[PDB]
Design a protein around this nucleic acid. Sequence first.
RNA 1: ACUAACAA
RNA 2: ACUAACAA
Lengths: 176, 176
Amino acid sequence: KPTPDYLMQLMNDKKLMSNHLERLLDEEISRVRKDMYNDTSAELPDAVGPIVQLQEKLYVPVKEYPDFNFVGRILGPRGLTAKQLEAETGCKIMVRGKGSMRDKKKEEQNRGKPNWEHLNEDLHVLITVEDAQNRAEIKLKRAVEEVKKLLVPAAEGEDSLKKMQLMELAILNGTY
Amino acid sequence: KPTPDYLMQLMNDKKLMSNHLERLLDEEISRVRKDMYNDTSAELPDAVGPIVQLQEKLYVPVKEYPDFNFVGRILGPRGLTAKQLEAETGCKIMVRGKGSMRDKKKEEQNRGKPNWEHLNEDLHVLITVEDAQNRAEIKLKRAVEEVKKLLVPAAEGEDSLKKMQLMELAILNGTY
RNA sequence: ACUAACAA
RNA sequence: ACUAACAA
């Protein structure tokens, strides 16, 4: 029974609590939320060959569409959207690049510092996998073919997804 | 992960707790336990016709096999076995008849008192259903064909089921 | 209800 | 590890 209200009555169930009890909740929460969006499926082959790591830097077109905030849409509230995506694909999703950090200031200092090399590239979405080739290509190409969706600006009033998160946010905020 | 130990670590999870939190547990518990026994499936048709009530008094053969305690085997610890059976069939399972009540004394007084008429019949297992005919016959004949199993004395050392409950008991007892 | 995860 | 539910 993945209802909106009862979901709000779940987050608060979780607010007061925080060894299986927690996990018990995290499952449904995710399961609810998944069902929320899925109202808007193949299976991986058995591993073949030595383990491989696959990346795909996917740049966001702020050069093309500066005004639109892609990044938020992707990450979502508590970064959950980005979190549910790593979950259902297996690929490590992470936002790197120029302007990654919301703050312009903090970013203006980490340049060159190890593991901040990525700050010298234009803004992108990084998608990494560790798995056997035939099993990873699929994993990758699943998440690849999903960020591209998020790298396409649904005009306001038609971005159903935007409202989805924004209501989720306004619940974590408790302002609604 | 329906493991025995973790199950014991569940009942005690439940001991300390006692609005969804409780229910959350009751599901797995049942689900675990079901999986426990199922290591030792059709679907009902859509209702057709006016609702009906079906019974089947099923007598236990103490006349034939006095020494063996059928009744316990059926009910099980906390009556759960009898409880999981009402669950998975839909039929109201209940033990009535002579010697129903463990105590001979208490029973020796309720004779004739309304809803204790059943004390004047030999010991039996009562199985009742409320549903449309075609849908109830199946429901009944599922539970019917399962009590008869429990009305057949598995000799000691071969009654795997007996140990199943007895370990479950010895957990609720906390003696193991 | 304008999201900030991830990485350190 | 010898079960006691259900019904009242």
